[PDB]
Design a protein around this motif. Structure first.
Motif, PDB file in Angstrom:
ATOM      1  N   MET A   3       0.859  -1.218   0.000  1.00 58.20           N
ATOM      2  CA  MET A   3       0.000   0.000   0.000  1.00 58.20           C
ATOM      3  C   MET A   3       0.885   1.255   0.000  1.00 58.20           C
ATOM      4  O   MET A   3       0.525   2.230  -0.691  1.00 58.20           O
ATOM      5  CB  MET A   3      -0.933   0.037   1.212  1.00 58.20           C
ATOM      6  N   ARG A   6       2.251   1.858  -3.500  1.00 57.20           N
ATOM      7  CA  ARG A   6       1.145   2.470  -4.290  1.00 57.20           C
ATOM      8  C   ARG A   6       1.009   3.964  -3.956  1.00 57.20           C
ATOM      9  O   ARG A   6       0.974   4.773  -4.909  1.00 57.20           O
ATOM     10  CB  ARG A   6      -0.172   1.729  -4.060  1.00 57.20           C
TER      11      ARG A   6
ATOM     12  N   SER B  33       0.173  -5.140   1.356  1.00 58.27           N
ATOM     13  CA  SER B  33      -0.696  -4.666   0.246  1.00 58.27           C
ATOM     14  C   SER B  33      -2.059  -4.162   0.753  1.00 58.27           C
ATOM     15  O   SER B  33      -2.653  -3.336   0.051  1.00 58.27           O
ATOM     16  CB  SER B  33      -0.871  -5.756  -0.786  1.00 58.27           C
TER      17      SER B  33
ATOM     18  N   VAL C   2      -7.591   0.030  -5.668  1.00 59.69           N
ATOM     19  CA  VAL C   2      -6.432   0.921  -5.354  1.00 59.69           C
ATOM     20  C   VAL C   2      -6.971   2.318  -5.019  1.00 59.69           C
ATOM     21  O   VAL C   2      -7.821   2.827  -5.769  1.00 59.69           O
ATOM     22  CB  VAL C   2      -5.419   0.959  -6.514  1.00 59.69           C
ATOM     23  N   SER C  34     -11.929   2.988  -0.229  1.00 58.71           N
ATOM     24  CA  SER C  34     -10.604   2.633  -0.802  1.00 58.71           C
ATOM     25  C   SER C  34      -9.462   3.391  -0.112  1.00 58.71           C
ATOM     26  O   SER C  34      -8.323   2.898  -0.196  1.00 58.71           O
ATOM     27  CB  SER C  34     -10.577   2.893  -2.286  1.00 58.71           C
TER      28      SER C  34
END
Lengths: 64, 56, 58, 65
Positions: A3, A6, B33, C2, C34
């Motif tokens: 994350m 990103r 993630s 995302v 998100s």
């Protein structure tokens, strides 16, 4: 791809695309930001965002 | 995968593999993630403390 | 999924409907789902500033 | 569908509640304050999920031991 990776990729893309908006798609003014973008983003994200940018800017003019 | 979902499944793997992170690399990725790095730092400190307290 | 994808889709909707938030309530939900709230607050300030700068010159 | 912040706050409230239950071997009475904080912090279907998940996990542990 985490994350945080990103977030950092998106930030670097935001700054790069912002520069491009303020210099009518003139890479030469946004060289350092383009370098950070490539450094910050996976190779396949860079390809995604470059192709997305083209589509969007060309769709505008087709519509204009 | 909701952040705490991916975290809980990582912690489940650690339980079932006697706290050996090497066995849980796939689930460590989904956790990383799913969760901001600030939350992961907090979660790693809570786990380390609580697992240590458990054994103590 | 995302955070920035959901933000970009919400922002695309805002463009398409004269910056009218009422039309884009669906994608606002997915944006909020998100993205951590701290990021949303920043992104909302960035959008407000940039959209306003658009008019202030053009 | 709850926002990311709502899921985060629900998780924190759930974490502290489950922690209390661990320190009192599932004795609900000694965690009523944290129970209340869990219910207000979490959507109705999340409360149900985590209550049934808790039961399954505890009873699975006993079944195996």
């Amino acid at each position: 791809p985490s994350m945080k990776e990103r977030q950092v990729c998106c930030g670097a893309r935001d700054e790069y695309w912002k520069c491009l908006d303020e210099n009518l798609e003139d890479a030469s003014q946004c060289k350092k930001l383009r370098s950070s973008f490539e450094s910050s983003c996976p190779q396949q994200w860079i390809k995604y965002f470059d192709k997305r940018r083209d589509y969007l800017k060309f769709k505008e003019k087709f519509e204009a």
